[PDB]
Design an enzyme around this catalytic site. Structure first.
Site, short mmCIF file in Angstrom:
data_model
loop_
_atom_site.label_atom_id
_atom_site.label_comp_id
_atom_site.label_asym_id
_atom_site.label_seq_id
_atom_site.Cartn_x
_atom_site.Cartn_y
_atom_site.Cartn_z
N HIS D 54 0.81 -1.22 0.00
CA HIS D 54 0.00 0.00 0.00
C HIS D 54 0.85 1.27 0.00
N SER D 77 1.81 -0.26 -5.17
CA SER D 77 0.90 -0.60 -4.09
C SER D 77 0.43 -2.04 -4.25
N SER D 82 -5.83 1.58 -2.18
CA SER D 82 -5.10 2.00 -0.99
C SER D 82 -4.03 3.07 -1.15
N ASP D 130 3.48 -7.40 0.62
CA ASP D 130 2.33 -7.31 1.52
C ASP D 130 1.16 -7.94 0.77
N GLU D 155 4.45 -9.15 4.93
CA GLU D 155 3.89 -8.45 6.08
C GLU D 155 2.49 -8.76 6.58
N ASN D 180 4.52 -10.58 9.59
CA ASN D 180 3.21 -10.46 10.20
C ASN D 180 3.11 -11.12 11.56
N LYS D 185 3.73 -7.09 15.64
CA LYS D 185 3.06 -6.77 14.39
C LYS D 185 1.63 -7.28 14.46
N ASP D 189 -0.46 -4.05 15.10
CA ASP D 189 -0.93 -3.57 13.80
C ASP D 189 -2.32 -4.17 13.51
N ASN D 190 -2.38 -5.49 13.38
CA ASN D 190 -3.63 -6.18 13.08
C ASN D 190 -4.79 -5.84 14.01
N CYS D 194 -6.59 -1.91 13.23
CA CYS D 194 -7.97 -1.96 12.75
C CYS D 194 -8.92 -1.29 13.73
N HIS D 300 -7.36 -8.85 3.27
CA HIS D 300 -6.47 -8.36 2.22
C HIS D 300 -7.06 -8.40 0.82
N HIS D 352 -4.19 2.41 8.72
CA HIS D 352 -3.76 2.48 10.11
C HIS D 352 -3.02 3.76 10.44
N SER D 360 5.05 -2.32 12.64
CA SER D 360 5.09 -3.19 11.48
C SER D 360 6.34 -2.94 10.66
N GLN D 364 9.82 -4.86 9.38
CA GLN D 364 10.02 -4.98 7.95
C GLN D 364 11.46 -4.62 7.57
N1 NAD Z 1 -6.87 -4.22 6.36
C1 NAD Z 1 -5.83 -4.21 7.31
O1 NAD Z 1 -5.34 -3.19 7.80
C2 NAD Z 1 -5.24 -5.64 7.81
C3 NAD Z 1 -4.28 -5.76 8.86
C4 NAD Z 1 -3.80 -7.13 9.07
C5 NAD Z 1 -4.41 -8.24 8.47
N2 NAD Z 1 -5.42 -7.98 7.56
C6 NAD Z 1 -6.06 -9.20 6.92
O2 NAD Z 1 -7.05 -9.73 7.80
C7 NAD Z 1 -7.30 -11.18 7.45
C8 NAD Z 1 -7.30 -12.12 8.63
O3 NAD Z 1 -7.11 -11.58 9.98
P1 NAD Z 1 -5.86 -11.90 10.98
O4 NAD Z 1 -6.63 -11.23 11.97
O5 NAD Z 1 -5.13 -11.32 9.81
O6 NAD Z 1 -6.11 -13.56 10.87
P2 NAD Z 1 -6.97 -14.75 11.58
O7 NAD Z 1 -7.02 -13.87 12.78
O8 NAD Z 1 -5.82 -15.61 11.04
O9 NAD Z 1 -8.05 -14.29 10.49
C9 NAD Z 1 -9.41 -14.88 10.21
C10 NAD Z 1 -10.16 -15.41 11.34
O10 NAD Z 1 -11.49 -15.73 10.83
C11 NAD Z 1 -11.83 -17.03 11.07
N3 NAD Z 1 -12.42 -17.51 9.85
C12 NAD Z 1 -11.86 -18.10 8.73
N4 NAD Z 1 -12.71 -18.43 7.77
C13 NAD Z 1 -13.95 -18.06 8.24
C14 NAD Z 1 -15.33 -18.17 7.60
N5 NAD Z 1 -15.61 -18.67 6.43
N6 NAD Z 1 -16.37 -17.65 8.43
C15 NAD Z 1 -16.21 -17.11 9.64
N7 NAD Z 1 -14.92 -17.00 10.26
C16 NAD Z 1 -13.80 -17.49 9.51
C17 NAD Z 1 -10.60 -17.86 11.54
O11 NAD Z 1 -10.86 -18.87 12.42
C18 NAD Z 1 -9.67 -16.75 11.99
O12 NAD Z 1 -9.68 -16.58 13.45
C19 NAD Z 1 -6.23 -11.39 6.28
O13 NAD Z 1 -6.96 -11.19 5.13
C20 NAD Z 1 -5.15 -10.34 6.53
O14 NAD Z 1 -4.37 -10.11 5.41
C21 NAD Z 1 -5.88 -6.69 7.17
N1 ADC Z 2 -1.26 3.34 6.48
C1 ADC Z 2 -0.84 2.12 6.05
N2 ADC Z 2 0.27 1.99 5.25
C2 ADC Z 2 0.68 0.79 4.83
N3 ADC Z 2 0.14 -0.42 5.08
C3 ADC Z 2 -0.98 -0.31 5.89
C4 ADC Z 2 -1.52 0.92 6.39
N4 ADC Z 2 -2.64 0.61 7.15
C5 ADC Z 2 -2.77 -0.68 7.12
N5 ADC Z 2 -1.80 -1.30 6.37
C6 ADC Z 2 -1.60 -2.74 6.15
C7 ADC Z 2 -2.57 -3.53 5.31
C8 ADC Z 2 -2.49 -4.87 5.58
C9 ADC Z 2 -1.48 -5.14 6.62
O1 ADC Z 2 -1.26 -6.19 7.19
C10 ADC Z 2 -1.27 -3.78 7.29
O2 ADC Z 2 0.08 -3.73 7.74
#
Ligand code: NAD
Ligand code: ADC
Ligand code: NAD
Ligand code: NAD
Ligand code: NAD
Ligand code: ADC
Ligand code: ADC
Ligand code: ADC
Lengths: 430, 430, 431, 431
Positions: D54, D77, D82, D130, D155, D180, D185, D189-190, D194, D300, D352, D360, D364
Site C-alpha cells: 500500500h 501498491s 489504498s 504485503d 507483512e 506479520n 506486528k 498492527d492487526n 484496525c 487483504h 492504520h 510493522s 520490515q
Molecule cells: N486491512 C488491514 O489493515 C489488515 C491488517 C492485518 C491483516 N489484515 C487481513 O485480515 C485477514 C485475517 O485476519 P488476521 O486477523 O489477519 O487472521 P486470523 O485472525 O488468522 O483471520 C481470520 C479469522 O477468521 C476465522 N475464519 C476463517 N474463515 C472463516 C469463515 N468462512 N467464516 C467465519 N470466520 C472465519 C478464523 O478462524 C480466523 O480466526 C487477512 O486477510 C489479513 O491479510 C488486514
Molecule cells: N497506512 C498504512 N500503510 C501501509 N500499510 C498499511 C496501512 N494501514 C494498514 N496497512 C496494512 C494492510 C495490511 C497489513 O497487514 C497492514 O500492515
C-alpha cells in the site's frame, strides 16, 4: 419491660469495631460531618427512629448521628440485609438496635416497633429507607405523627411513595428526598450496584459471568449499574424497559432491548432493577434455560413471583443460606437468591463503604435541616440545596486525591456564577 | 498407620455435594470426558498423586479421574486455597484427601507426603499445580521417580520450573505443559482472574474499586485480567512491566505504565501478577497512601515482602481470617491479604466453575495421554495437540449456546485446512 | 430587488447534496415521522422561520421538514466552518434561501444571518437558533422586529445558557423553548453524538493514533463525558479537568485521573476543551506541551483556546491542509491546532451522525409547532417541552433500532401510580 | 529507454506529501530509530528492493528509510484503492520509482508491479511484499529472476499464509521472513490498527452512526477482535461469526453473541468481513439484510463479499461518491457497498495510524537487513525474526508514549532464570 436491644450475637462486637474502624477511613464524608458538628451538637434533643439496612456503613452513620447529639434507636429495613457484627458493635455501644440477618416478617415488624418509643418520649425524627417506618407511623401510629418534625427518605421506592402520599393529602410531616440528591442517585444507585450486584451473585453462586446471557429488567440508575457490571465481566446483557428514553439509552450503549417474554428464553442470569410487581412470572420461569440464576435488587421483594416457584416446583433444595435451587416439572432447575429480596445486601455486604459515605452524608445533612430549621420545610417533600449537594461530593475528592479547578474571577463572571456557589441549573441532569 | 484422609470437618460433606452438584452443571467439559470414558476406564491402573488447590471445581476433576478408573490421592498446592466442604465431600467419597483451609507450612508438606503411597504401591502419575509435588519427588524421592510415568502441570510458575529442570538435565519424567494449552492460559489465566481477583479483594475488604488508583505489577495473562477487572469497576489502573511488548500492550490499552517505585506513591490497591521475587518492598510500603490494600495473585507468596511488615510495623491488628491491618512507624496503615498468598483462592473461592472446566479438561486429557501413550512422550515437556485443544473449547460452546460455523468444502480447500482438523498454525497466538 | 435568492459555495453540488440527504433521511425516523404526520395539516403555515444552525446534511432534512409542514424558511449556519456545501447547495436548489458555505469570514458570517431576517412578505415570525447568535443579534440590533417574533427555539447548551441569563436580566423579550435540555437531546446528542464525531474530526484532520497517548479533556459535562469515553475507547489515557465537584467525582468514579490544566498541559498529546467558557488553554499551557500536541475545541464558541497567543508567539505557522495549522513555538516544539479553535467535529468532519441528530431536530420541530400554534401557552421566558413529548421523541427511534419496548400492565401501572402511556418519570428524574 | 521514471496521479501533491510524511515521521520513532542507527553503515547497500505494499504516507517513511540505509528501491501498491496520492507523489519527486495512484484498474495494478522488477543495474535482489502478489508474480511469471533474489519479506496474514502453502508444496524458492507473525506486528498492527482504521473507513464513506446498531463481524482473529471492540466501543451490538472453536469461545467470553452468517445476515445494519477466505456474504445473505445495511470487507483480498452478485442482481446501482455504491435489490431494499469489497480502512480512509505502523515497518526493515546481510542464516523457507529483536521493536516505541519500563534486578533475573536484557519469554508465549 423492653429489651435494651436485640441482635444475633453481641459477641461479634469486637469484629464489629474492626469493620467499622476500617469503614470510617473510607467515609470521609460522615467523618467530615463529625469533626464539624461534634461540638455544636446540632441534633441535640432529636429522637431519631432509623429503619435502614443495619450494615457496617449504617453503623458509622448511626454513631455520627450520636456524635451530633441525637438519641437514636434502630432497625433494618429488610430481614436479610443486617450484618450481625455491625449490629452487635452498635448494641454494645449502648444504642438500641433491633436487627439480625434472617428475621421473619413478624420479627421484622417487631423490631421497627421497638424503636418508636424512647426513654423520654416518642421519636422526633424519621430516617427511613424504603418508607416502611414512615408508612407504619402514618397508618398505625397517626397519633405520634404530630410529634414528628421531619422524614428523611433514602431510596427510590421510598421516595416514590412519599410523592404518592403527599399527592393524596396523606403525607403529614415534612420529608426530604435524599435519594434524588445528585450525589446519591447518580452515585450510590449507579456505582454502588455496579460493584455490589456481582458481589451478591458471586458469594451466593460463584458462577462465571463471562460468556453468559444476562437479562436486566429496567435501565434506571440501578439498571445501568447492574448492566455495565455484568458485561464488564463478559456477559451479553439483554435489557427490558417500559420507558422509551431509558430504552433508547440502552440501545445507544450497545445492549439489545426486548421484552421479558423474549429474553426469558435466553437468560442464564436475571436481575430485576424495576420498581414494580410482576416482572418474572411462571410463564417466564418455565422457559428459562437449565440453572438460570434469578435475583432481584429492587427494594421490595415483589418483582419475582417467588411463590409460583414454591407452588409449582417438583423440588426445592437449599444449597446454603439465601440460595435455593428449584427443579420445575419440565426437569430443568432454577437458582433463586435471597428469596427475591435485594441480592446485594441479602447475599453480600451491599454497597462499598466509600460510595455509601455520599448517601449517608446527605442523610445527616437532611436530618440537621429538618431538625434545626423546621420553619424552612412545609409539609411535603423537598430536595437538599444544590450547594449542599455539591459539598457532599467535594468532601470525597481529597480521599481520591482529585485536584479540582478553581474558576477564576474573570471566568466566573463570563459564566455568570459564583466561583463557589452553585455550578449548575436546578434542571441539570449530570 | 495412615489416616484414610484429613479434613477440617467431614460434616460439611452434605453441603459439599450441594456445591459439586451445581459446579458439575457448569463444567460441560469434565462432564463430557466422563460420559465418553466412564466405560473404557482409560486411566485404569493409574495411581495419581494430585497437588492442586482443593476446591469445589477440583473435586469435580478428582471424581472425573476416578470415573475413568484411576486410584487418586490428593492434597492442595496452597495452605489457604482449600475449600473445606469440597474437601470433605471428597473424603466422604472414600478418596484420600489431605487439605483444609489454614494449613501450616509443616502440615502443607505433611499432606503432600500422605498422597505419595497407595495401597498397591507408589504413584504412577503426577497431576501438579505449581510444581511442589514434582519438585518434592525429584528432590526427596528420586527413588519413586523411575516408577512414575508422567507429570501433568497446570500453572505458569510450575511449567516455568519444568522447562528449567529439563534444561538442567534434572527433569526425569515426561511432563505435559497444560497451562500453555491455548484453552487454558488464554482463558483460565485471563478470564478467570478477571472475575476472581475482585472477588477475593471484596470478600476480604469490601472496599470500593471505583475512584481509586490500583497498581498491577505485570501484564501477562493474569495481569491483563486483573487490570481489566479493576478499571471495569472504575479504578485508574497503573501497570508495571519489565517486558517491552507487554508494556507496549498496556499503554496501547490505555493504562499508564511505570515503575513500582513511582506507583507505590499513588496506589490505593496493589496486585502482583508477576512470577518473581521482590516486587513490593519496604521502600514501597513506606510511601504508600493510608490503608493501601496489598495482595498477590502469583502462585508462590514471594512477590510481596510480608516479613518486612511483620518486622517493621508498629501494629498488626487482624481484622478477620486472611486479613491483617498494619500500622507503620509513619502512622499510616496497610491492609495485607492472605499473607501474600494468592488472594483469589485465599480470600475467595478462586475461579468460577465454568472457566475451570477448560483447565481441567486439558488436565484429564493430559493424564490420559501420558498414561495410555507413554511411548509418545519422551522425557521432556510437551503441549497437547492443537486438535485436542480446539476440542476442549468446542466442548463448552453448547453450554453458552454458541453456534459455530462449518467451513464449507469449497472454503476448506481455499484455506488449505480440514473443515475439522486444526484451524491454525502452531505459532498462532489467538 | 438585489437580494440574492441565496449564496453557497457551488450550486453544482446539488446532485450529490440529494444523495446525502436521501440517505440521511433513512437514518432520521424522527423528522420523517413528523413529516408524515403534519404534511397535511401544515401546522407551521404562516410561520416565517429564520434559522441559524450549522448548515449540514442533517440540518437540510430538518429544513425541508419545516417546509413540508408549511413554514417559509430562510437559513444560515451558526458557524463559519461547519457548513457542508453539497447540503447547502441541495437546499439552495430547492428554492430555499440559504446563506452559508464552508470557510466564511466573520463579516460574511454576520452577512449571511442578516440575509435571512426579511422575507418576501415581512420579517421573521420565528427563530430557530443554535448558539444564540440569531436571537442575540435581533435583541441587540433589531429590537423592533422583536414584537413581531412569536417564539425562540434554542438547541445547544451555550445558547440556552444565554437565554437564562437574558431572561434573568429582563432582556429576553420573546418566549423561548430550551430544546437542548430536553432529555432526548442533552443526554443523547451532546453525549453520544460527540462520542462519535470528536474522533472523526481529529482523525480526518490529523490521522494520528489515539491509542497509547495521553488525552486531556477539559470539562466533564455531557460533551466531556462523550469525548472522554470515545478517546479511551481507542486506547488513550484520558486526563480530565473540572471546576464542579460532582462532575469531577463522576470522572474519578469512572476511572479518569482528574487534575488541573496547569498539570495536565505537561502530559497531554491531545487536548479537547468541552468547557463552555474562556481561558482554558493559554500560553502558559502551550509552552509546556509535548512536541506535536494536538489542541482542539468542541465547545460552541471558539473562546476556550487562546489561538491568538499562538499566532502572536509562534516562530512558524505551517498550514498542513484546510483547518489544520502546525505551529513551531520558540522552544522548538510544535503544536497542531484544528479549525482555529472552532468546534472540531463540524469544522474538521461532518459533525454528529444522522441518527442521533433526528432526536435533536425532532425536538426542534416540536418546539417550533408549540410556539407557533400555541403562543398563549408560553409567556415570555424559557420553557421545556412536556416530558410526554420528550418520551415520544425517543419512542420514535425505537423501531429503527428494532427495540421492543415493554408495555406496563394495567395492574402494574396502578402499583407504580402512572399511566401505562403518560409520563413515566418525575420532572426531576435525571436519566 | 521508454520506461517512465515513475507514474502517479499528480506530482503536484509533492508539497503536501512532505507535510504528511514530515508529521508521520514524528509518530514513527521506530523507523526513525533505524535510520539514525544505520544511515552511516548503509547495511542495505547493493540491495535492489522491489516493494509491493500500500503506497501510503507511512509506507513513504519506510521507503525513504530503506533508502537512507542504502538500498535502491522501486515501488507499487498491493491494492488499487489504498494508494495515497500526495504520499505517492512525494516519493516520486524524491527520485524513487513509484507506480501507484488511488483508483487503479486490475490491468494498471499488474502494470505497476512489473515496472518495479527491473533496475538500472539489473533485477531485484529483495522482495518486500504485503499480500504475496509480488512474490507470487515472480514465482509464476518470472521464475528465472528467482535465483537472483536473496530474500522475501512478507507483512500481512494472507501473504504469509500463502508462503507456508508454497513452502509446503516445494514451490517456495527463496528465503522469506514472516513479519506479520512477529509479535509486535500481529498483536498490534492487526488488532490496534484496525480498532482505529475500520471505523475511520466506514465513517468517511458513510457518516452513519455506529451506536444503537447491530454490526456483524465475520471472524474473530486479530483483525476481528480489533473491529468488534471498535464497533461496540461506539455503542453497536456486535454479532460475531467464526469457524474456530477457540476464537468463537473467546468472543462469547468477551460478551459477543456468536452465530452463523445465515442468522446474522437478517440482523446486521453493518457487516465487516475479517475472515481470510471466500464466500462469506452471498446473495442468500444480501437478500435478507435490512434496508441500507452497510457491507464492507477488511481482509487483504476482495474475495469475501460476492460483489458480482450485487452488480448482477441489483435493480439499481447509484454511486454516492468514490468507493461508495448504493444498490437497490429487487425486494426494494437498499445496500451500501464500500470500496467494492476491497479492504475498507485503506480504500475509504487512510488505513492504520502512523504510530502502530512504525512497529510493522520496523520489523520490515529488520527483516530486509537480516536476509540481505546474513543470507547464510536463512535457508529456503519461512522464518520469524528473533524474539530479542521483536522485543526491541516494542522497546523502541516506549519513549514516545513515555512508558517507564522496569529493569529486572540481578537477584530477580536469576530467580526467573533469564537475562535482565535477553528474551523475556518462551517461543510459545502468546502475549
Ligand atoms: N486491512 C488491514 O489493515 C489488515 C491488517 C492485518 C491483516 N489484515 C487481513 O485480515 C485477514 C485475517 O485476519 P488476521 O486477523 O489477519 O487472521 P486470523 O485472525 O488468522 O483471520 C481470520 C479469522 O477468521 C476465522 N475464519 C476463517 N474463515 C472463516 C469463515 N468462512 N467464516 C467465519 N470466520 C472465519 C478464523 O478462524 C480466523 O480466526 C487477512 O486477510 C489479513 O491479510 C488486514
Ligand atoms: N497506512 C498504512 N500503510 C501501509 N500499510 C498499511 C496501512 N494501514 C494498514 N496497512 C496494512 C494492510 C495490511 C497489513 O497487514 C497492514 O500492515
Ligand atoms: N439494592 C440497592 O442497593 C439499591 C440502590 C438504590 C435503589 N434501589 C432500588 O432500585 C429500584 C429502582 O431503580 P432506580 O434505579 O432506583 O429507579 P428507576 O431508575 O426509577 O427504576 C426502574 C426503572 O425500570 C423501568 N421499569 C419500571 N417498571 C418496569 C417493568 N415492569 N419492566 C421493565 N422495566 C420497568 C423504569 O422505566 C425505570 O427506568 C427501587 O426499587 C430502588 O429502591 C436498590
Ligand atoms: N491465582 C490464579 O488463579 C492464577 C492463574 C494462572 C496463573 N497464575 C500465576 O500468575 C503468575 C504469572 O502470570 P501468567 O499471566 O501466569 O504469566 P506472565 O504472563 O508469564 O506473568 C508475569 C508477567 O509479569 C512480567 N514480569 C515479570 N517479572 C516482573 C517484575 N519484577 N516487575 C514487573 N513485571 C514483571 C512479565 O514480563 C510477564 O508478562 C504465575 O505466578 C502463575 O502461576 C495465578
Ligand atoms: N460540538 C458539538 O457537537 C456540541 C454538542 C452539544 C453541546 N456542545 C457545547 O459543549 C459545551 C458544554 O457541554 P455540555 O456538555 O454542553 O455542558 P456542561 O456539561 O454544561 O459543559 C461544561 C462542563 O465543563 C465544566 N467546566 C466549566 N468551566 C470549566 C473550566 N474553566 N475548566 C474546566 N471545566 C469547566 C462544568 O462544570 C461543566 O460540567 C457548550 O459549549 C455547548 O454548546 C457542542
Ligand atoms: N452497605 C450498605 N449499607 C447501607 N445501605 C446500603 C448499603 N448498600 C446499599 N444500601 C442501600 C439500599 C438501598 C439504597 O437505596 C441504598 O442506600
Ligand atoms: N476454583 C479453582 N479451583 C482450582 N484451581 C483454581 C481455581 N481458581 C484458580 N485456580 C488455579 C490456580 C492457579 C492456576 O493456574 C489455576 O488453575
Ligand atoms: N451534523 C450536524 N448538523 C447540525 N448540527 C449539528 C451536527 N452535529 C452536531 N451539531 C450540533 C452542534 C451543536 C449542538 O448542540 C449540536 O446539536
Amino acid at each position: 419491660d423492653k429489651l435494651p436491644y436485640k441482635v444475633a450475637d453481641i459477641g461479634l462486637a469486637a469484629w464489629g469495631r474492626k469493620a467499622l474502624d476500617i469503614a470510617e477511613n473510607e467515609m470521609p464524608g460522615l467523618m467530615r460531618m463529625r469533626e464539624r458538628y461534634s461540638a455544636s451538637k446540632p441534633l441535640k434533643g432529636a429522637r431519631i427512629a432509623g429503619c435502614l439496612h443495619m450494615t457496617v456503613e449504617t453503623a458509622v452513620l448511626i454513631e455520627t448521628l450520636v456524635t451530633l447529639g441525637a438519641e437514636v434507636q434502630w432497625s433494618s429495613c429488610n430481614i436479610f440485609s443486617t450484618q450481625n457484627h455491625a449490629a452487635a458493635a452498635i448494641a454494645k455501644a449502648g444504642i438500641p438496635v433491633y436487627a439480625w440477618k434472617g428475621e421473619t416478617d413478624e420479627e421484622y415488624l417487631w423490631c421497627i416497633e421497638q424503636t418508636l418509643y424512647f426513654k423520654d418520649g416518642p421519636l422526633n425524627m424519621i430516617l427511613d429507607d424504603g418508607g416502611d417506618l414512615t408508612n407504619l407511623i402514618h397508618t398505625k401510629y397517626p397519633q405520634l405523627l404530630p410529634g414528628i418534625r421531619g422524614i428523611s427518605e433514602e431510596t427510590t421506592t421510598g421516595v416514590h411513595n412519599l410523592y404518592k402520599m403527599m399527592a393524596n393529602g396523606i403525607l403529614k410531616v415534612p420529608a426530604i428526598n435524599v435519594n434524588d440528591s445528585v450525589t446519591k442517585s447518580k452515585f450510590d444507585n449507579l456505582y454502588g450496584c455496579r460493584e455490589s450486584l456481582i458481589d451478591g451473585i458471586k458469594r451466593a453462586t460463584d458462577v462465571m459471568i463471562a460468556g453468559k446471557v444476562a437479562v436486566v429488567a429496567g435501565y434506571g440508575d440501578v439498571g445501568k449499574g447492574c448492566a455495565q457490571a455484568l458485561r464488564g465481566f463478559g456477559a451479553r446483557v439483554i435489557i427490558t424497559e417500559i420507558d422509551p428514553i431509558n430504552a433508547l439509552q440502552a440501545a445507544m450503549e450497545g445492549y439489545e432491548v426486548t421484552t421479558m417474554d423474549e429474553a426469558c428464553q435466553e437468560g442464564n442470569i436475571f436481575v430485576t432493577t424495576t420498581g414494580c410487581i410482576d416482572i418474572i412470572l411462571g410463564r417466564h420461569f418455565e422457559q428459562m434455560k437449565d440453572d438460570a440464576i434469578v435475583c432481584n435488587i429492587g427494594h421490595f421483594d415483589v418483582e419475582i413471583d417467588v411463590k409460583w416457584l414454591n407452588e409449582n416446583a417438583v423440588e426445592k433444595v437449599n444449597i446454603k443460606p439465601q440460595v435455593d435451587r428449584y427443579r420445575l416439572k419440565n426437569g430443568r432447575r432454577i437458582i433463586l437468591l435471597a428469596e427475591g429480596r435485594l441480592v446485594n445486601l441479602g447475599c453480600a455486604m451491599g454497597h462499598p463503604s466509600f460510595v455509601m459515605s455520599n448517601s449517608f452524608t446527605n442523610q445527616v445533612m437532611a436530618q440537621i435541616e429538618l431538625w434545626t430549621h423546621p420553619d424552612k420545610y412545609p409539609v411535603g417533600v423537598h430536595f437538599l440545596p444544590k450547594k449542599l449537594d455539591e459539598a457532599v461530593a467535594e468532601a470525597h475528592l481529597g480521599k481520591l486525591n482529585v485536584k479540582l479547578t478553581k474558576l477564576t474571577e474573570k471566568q466566573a463572571q463570563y459564566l455568570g456564577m459564583s466561583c463557589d456557589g452553585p455550578f449548575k441549573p436546578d434542571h441539570y441532569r449530570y
